[PDB]
Design a binder for this molecule. Structure first.
Ligand SMILES: CC(C)C1=CC2=CC[C@@H]3[C@](C)(CCC[C@@]3(C)C(=O)N[C@@H](Cc3c[nH]c4ccccc34)C(=O)O)[C@H]2CC1
Length: 456
């Protein structure tokens, strides 16, 4: 039967729009999903979307013959500085497929062998920072994980050192990037954006864009000027030719790719490490098991690529953190033709869906009753997981190109953290999830006690 879709509470002419007038929209949408179930309609003046939460329906939304990636309003606002890089381009734009074909070999599991040593450089700085803490100082976890992740993508991506472990104030590029991202997010719940009240925002936006463009174009120019070949994405993009068109990326697009990778390598990836460490300190038996793996595998002063691959349980820890709090929590699709979703909901060509990943990852039909428990063991036998049940990296040809990079970095860093330190949840931290572009455990702090194992 053709079933009428649930809808959350309305506000007259504003429809559902005020429900997202909140600093925690994803968590609000999760509560609505708990009340309304696997799908609900969300209307606002001039737009309708449908939010999906069940594996049953998301497995169909993940059919690329029926649905393609949509640019959400969030992605549209980011496109003002991320342009037609991979993240903010439509599948049908020529620059999408070109960049996809050129960049895929730079992001493969195999290509991680090449980035491994630069990743180690940044992880060693993190370990050394923590070794150098005085007794009863503490660690600001998201803050340090972001220093690591941002620096790792800068170094591996374009041989640039943000030197984040040398600073309290972020590098000028970062300042502008974070403020552009914040601005892009603010625009989502901003009525009358054309109001002259927001004159100053617009001017600040344009300054931040200029900062970002100037530094990246200059890095681009300098590399071409020097002609040096490096272990980095910038080299692969200057050299690469798309097999299909035979064309290279132009300098403007390369800039957008760089800005894109820096956005991703910032709080999106550091979020994974932060949530992983949160769950470990709140689950001491899991921490112990992971620590025993790190001690057994990481037998050398500095981890090898092969050793990181051996950290199976650490990999499961990361997957279980991705299950509960995926740091890129939603993505958008549109129907390529008229179609019926789940045998019950007719859609017209162009109709949009949002996949609410955290809610997908709580589907009791897939995971069982214990959905709120942190149990990395759920990931021991990945073949048993039904199709499209676990989607922290999105879907299909438009899935995260950075997934292997993010997981290698995370596994290496968490491995080393677990080898070098015992951790204390010294404040009995109460989880508070701050929502920006991404999700993070705000104010999460720990004490680390060195196990006194050398890096030399
Ligand atoms: C850039 C990438 C990393 C992101 C992707 C996102 C996708 C869905 C977003 C997001 C989680 C931010 C919170 C709003 C939400 C859930 C959304 O549904 N937004 C819809 C619905 C919506 C909210 N406000 C709007 C204003 C106009 C039009 C649509 C909307 C949208 O963006 O389209 C957001 C985080 C940032």
């Amino acid at each position: 039967t053709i079933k009428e879709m649930p809808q959350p509470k309305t506000f007259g002419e504003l429809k559902n729009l005020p429900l997202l007038n909140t600093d925690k929209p994803v968590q609000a949408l999760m509560k609505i999903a708990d009340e309304l179930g696997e799908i609900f309609k969300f209307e606002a003046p001039g737009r309708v979307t449908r939010y999906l939460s069940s594996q049953r329906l998301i497995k169909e939304a993940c059919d690329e013959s029926r649905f393609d990636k949509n640019l959400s309003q969030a992605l549209k606002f980011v496109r003002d500085f991320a342009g037609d890089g991979l993240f903010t381009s439509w599948t049908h734009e020529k620059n999408w497929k070109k960049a996809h074909n050129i960049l895929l070999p730079s992001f493969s599991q195999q290509a991680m062998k090449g980035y491994h040593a630069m990743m180690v450089d940044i992880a060693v700085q993190l370990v050394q920072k923590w070794e150098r803490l005085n007794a009863d100082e503490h660690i600001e976890v998201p803050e340090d994980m972001t220093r690591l992740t941002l620096d790792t993508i800068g170094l591996c991506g374009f041989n640039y050192r943000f030197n984040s472990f040398y600073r309290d104030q972020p590098h000028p590029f970062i300042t502008s990037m974070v403020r552009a991202l914040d601005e892009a997010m603010n625009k989502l719940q901003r009525a009358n954006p054309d109001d002259p009240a927001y004159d100053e925002n617009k001017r600040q936006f344009q300054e931040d864009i200029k900062v970002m463009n100037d530094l990246v174009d200059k890095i681009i120019a300098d590399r071409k000027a020097s002609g040096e070949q490096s272990d980095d994405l910038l080299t692969h993009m200057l050299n690469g030719k798309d097999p299909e068109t035979g064309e290279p990326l132009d300098d403007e697009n390369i800039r957008y790719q760089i800005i894109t990778f820096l956005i991703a390598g910032h709080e999106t990836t550091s979020g994974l490490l932060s949530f992983a460490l949160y769950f470990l300190v709140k689950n001491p038996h899991v921490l112990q098991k992971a620590a025993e793996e790190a001690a057994r595998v990481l037998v050398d002063p500095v981890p090898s690529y092969k050793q990181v691959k051996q950290l199976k349980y650490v990999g499961m820890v990361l997957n279980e953190a991705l299950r509960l709090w995926p740091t890129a929590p939603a993505f958008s699709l549109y129907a390529k033709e008229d179609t019926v979703l789940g045998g019950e909901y007719p859609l017209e060509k162009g109709d949009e869906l949002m996949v609410l990943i955290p809610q997908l990852h709580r589907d009791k039909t897939i995971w069982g009753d214990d959905v709120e428990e942190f149990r990395p063991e759920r990931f021991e036998n990945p073949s048993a997981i039904p199709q499209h049940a676990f989607k922290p990296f999105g879907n299909g040809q438009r899935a995260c190109i950075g997934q292997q990079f993010a997981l290698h970095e995370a596994t290496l860093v968490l491995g080393m953290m677990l080898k070098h330190f015992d951790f204390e949840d010294h404040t009995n931290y109460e989880l508070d999830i701050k929502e920006t572009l991404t999700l993070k455990p705000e104010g999460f702090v720990v004490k680390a006690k060195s196990k006194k194992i050398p890096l030399g």
